[PDB]
Amino acid sequence: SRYSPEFKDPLIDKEYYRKPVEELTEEEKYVRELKKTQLIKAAPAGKTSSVFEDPVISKFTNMMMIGGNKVLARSLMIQTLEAVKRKQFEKYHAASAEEQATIERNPYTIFHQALKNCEPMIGLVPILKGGRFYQVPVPLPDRRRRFLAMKWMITECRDKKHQRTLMPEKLSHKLLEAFHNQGPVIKRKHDLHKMAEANRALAHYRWW
């Protein structure tokens, strides 16, 4: 790293800095006075103070990026969000008043809940015992659960089954299925859970 270890990570929250001083705890006050004496890294070119900034979508965009082409990756993301919004508006317009209440038209809400539905609660770790590898059910950390949901979604959309279907069309369709607890990505989560339940007796092989 070109930054020395002293450099601290920039905090980019408008509301944090505007917080009234009176509400600050004694520890919080110390943290603020200390920061004034500390070197800070230049803010990266990705995250900003914009009210429209979504960290999860930014991470998903980077996972889609190929060869540093963030412009193309970002184009695919915004096309997907627009495609989802247009599909829900069509479904909303063709629905009855009672049905219209239950139709979600916010693409960010759909994107967040579709990925949450794909997150696996339990994982499998290969453990070598007596020269034989065993798939052992293990608890997954929160970061790994979220990462796996995104990787499965992107891997599914990149699968060759989809013939001459552009990514925004494929991704929007898959996100809407997962939002409704359907589709192959949800099936991949269920398979992992079923495999871990079958191997529940091997859980003792784990030593942590």
Place this chain on the structure above:
RNA sequence: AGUAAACUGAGAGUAGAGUGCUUAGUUGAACAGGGCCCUGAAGCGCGUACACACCGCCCGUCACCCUCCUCAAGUAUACUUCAAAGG
């Protein structure tokens, strides 16, 4: 981590010649959390028939061979004893 990845120039050398080499720049990620289970390191121990130093050393049969010895049906040769006796 301006790393990987992708993309774009230049240079060395030739008369000419590389999909090679050297080098400048552009866009620009993901994971970094657990573990000692597998490999390896350090500290402190233990063991050791190794010192060419475990790619070490080393045991037995089988095969092949030289010397010596033992057992052994017979057969052959030499050697010891008889009188230190009795009628």
